[PDB]
Design a protein around this ligand. Sequence first.
Ligand SMILES: Nc1ncnc2c1ncn2[C@@H]1O[C@H](COP(=O)(O)OP(=O)(O)O)[C@@H](O)[C@H]1O
Ligand SMILES: Nc1ncnc2c1ncn2[C@@H]1O[C@H](COP(=O)(O)OP(=O)(O)O)[C@@H](O)[C@H]1O
Ligand SMILES: [Mg+2]
Ligand SMILES: [Mg+2]
Lengths: 375, 375, 39
Amino acid sequence: DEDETTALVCDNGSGLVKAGFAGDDAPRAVFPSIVGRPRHQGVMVGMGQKDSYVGDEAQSKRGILTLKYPIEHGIITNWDDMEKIWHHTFYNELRVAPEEHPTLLTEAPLNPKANREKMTQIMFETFNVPAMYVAIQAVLSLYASGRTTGIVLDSGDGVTHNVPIYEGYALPHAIMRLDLAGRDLTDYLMKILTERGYSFVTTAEREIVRDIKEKLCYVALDFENEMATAASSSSLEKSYELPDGQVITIGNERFRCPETLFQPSFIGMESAGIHETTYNSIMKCDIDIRKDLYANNVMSGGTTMYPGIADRMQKEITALAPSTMKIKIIAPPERKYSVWIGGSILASLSTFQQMWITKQEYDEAGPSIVHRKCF
Amino acid sequence: DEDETTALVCDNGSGLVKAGFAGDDAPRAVFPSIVGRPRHQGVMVGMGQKDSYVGDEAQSKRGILTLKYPIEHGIITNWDDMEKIWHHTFYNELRVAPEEHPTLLTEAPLNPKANREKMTQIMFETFNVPAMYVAIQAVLSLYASGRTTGIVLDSGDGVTHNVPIYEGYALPHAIMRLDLAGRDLTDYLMKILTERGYSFVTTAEREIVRDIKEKLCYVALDFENEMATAASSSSLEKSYELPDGQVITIGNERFRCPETLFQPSFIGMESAGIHETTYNSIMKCDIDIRKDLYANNVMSGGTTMYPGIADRMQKEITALAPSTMKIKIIAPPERKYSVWIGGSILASLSTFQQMWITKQEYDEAGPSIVHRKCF
Amino acid sequence: ALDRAEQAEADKKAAEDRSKQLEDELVSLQKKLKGTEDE
Ligand SMILES: Nc1ncnc2c1ncn2[C@@H]1O[C@H](COP(=O)(O)OP(=O)(O)O)[C@@H](O)[C@H]1O
Ligand SMILES: Nc1ncnc2c1ncn2[C@@H]1O[C@H](COP(=O)(O)OP(=O)(O)O)[C@@H](O)[C@H]1O
Ligand SMILES: [Mg+2]
Ligand SMILES: [Mg+2]
């Protein structure tokens, strides 16, 4: 299927795995990060004895399979799910073995050392891979953006990373990760819908309402004013049609769901909102480059697909920062895949072909030394 | 409770307020500098309507109250917290009114004029105090040390001051403040523990790990060699028992946490380490007295309670300065309270009773003139 | 019985914390004494 000896770019982002060959502009195999496991034991004869579903095979059946998240906040919980999702991506979709081409994986900023050593060991010992490389997502996203300056805000599913890069330089000190993202928003919407009257307590409905949020939920331009005008609703409340057919009616809750990002007090945490944390990060940077960080801020992550985030960011930053300079916020189209896109354009360089880590040096050095070599 | 008309020594140091009457050898009321504010709104009936907790009342409950620091880097952020902590210290612990005795407060070197004018105004207009006085911490610490020569290194919680005093002579031009202290060390330990695997993002855990650091974290005598020998750990890693019961295992991170003081590059700041900044300060002084500053260097601040700071300072200064002279470093026992102790022995002199500032002259002159009179 | 057990356990925890603090202070003091003797 592939006639070019190039690394397979597999972005294992929290919530959605995006795998594809280098050189492509979009991932071909896109599936959620979920593992379905047979709950009961059947006396039936003939069905697949497979004890571990994955991807679309699990999405197609969520009532029988208990759903487990292979990644939580960033820390890898179960490694069997890791081996399952890579083995599946290798021998069920791509139809190619890892013994013929490299593999450029993308990991989140500020992750545990155990996670890195574990994935590297599974990719070297178990699977025969000629070479591995771990890369931070923020750099590849800035590559795909086509710039060298700005602060990347990557909001995945269970973690949110703010990474400032000015003039093409990393700042490992200022990267601050906060576990507020799509899962805590799904939980907030679920508890407020339970407050509305429709109560559910199973994961399949949680994924359904997550999809409903992805499709409908947006960000408000003025929270309190929308609350007041929605008190007497007319066009502000919408009636959604569940894929099963049950008629759901959702009004203001939509534009109050992502608001939890701006007010973490809703989930009883002393952490500051994403905008205030980004602002504090800007103060932690130097003054000289702060204006450039204001003018080149970039966004990444699937959570940014909601309509109305750019305007909300502009008003909040204008209210926090002075209103004398110019603070333009740029969001490139299809930003979610941009990271993966970067991977593709990063795997075609010959120099990058010279910066890989082969098996033998890793085996003698050991995983810890490999951690030192990368950074 | 008090039968002597003597000033109340209230050291409002960053991180810990230490209040007590003059003449005593240690502060009786010692509580952290924190303000707990009710996060949610309760429908319950009967609980205290008090809207602002302080001190031990806030320490006892950190899960319900969002914690705010009343002092940051040195600059006073919120004045309501100031009024709260003084009113509390006056009408909840000491059980004495400020209308009967003076008050000798201690402020940090090189502080804003707004801070001084604000505290003086709250201490004159609002509260009826017969007389106020602002004092620098370094002089009182040198008093308690029982000498007149040396360079005082006061490392509080959010600021670190290096103050050279030779023959009792202050040098306002050489005092250089740098905002590297216990909070940036707590942040570094937190991010590296998040790197280890245990991730938290709330202030209560931050205070808990701060206490864990105060109890366990020490300074290394040789960073790289300890790194090498800790690669294969045995007795170098310790298993701590959280007050809640969760078994934490912390190894090298301990003696790498305060190392950020010696290598500010970890937090991406061009500032120099505390030892190098002190060395540069010594070059800024005159050569004649430099040897005396080498032989009489004194330390102050709670951050100095870690074991192994004296030896690390000696090796670093010996590596930086020549090794021909004698460079003895002296650290008096219970140095943290020494400052406060000084206050006590400073409030008993009759001459000091003649150097106070009464209400009437301040009222006619105004606060700015009061600033000129002090210095 | 459980109340007395919990009280005794609290007292034991306090005593053991004090003992461990004293042991840490003692080993640090021994190191300082060794250094002073070398000097
Ligand atoms: N099309 C979409 N619309 C709205 N939200 C989305 C969409 N796709 C993903 N998300 C949200 O983004 C999160 C996953 O993001 P992720 O795939 O990790 O981004 P990236 O791959 O850029 O790191 C989930 O919480 C999900 O709710
Ligand atoms: N017993 C202790 N052990 C270790 N560190 C301490 C201790 N007490 C205070 N500290 C540290 O000192 C800082 C506060 O110092 P501070 O009370 O301002 O000193 P001072 O009162 O001498 O100015 C905090 O960052 C805290 O972590
Ligand atoms: Mg993302
Ligand atoms: Mg201090």
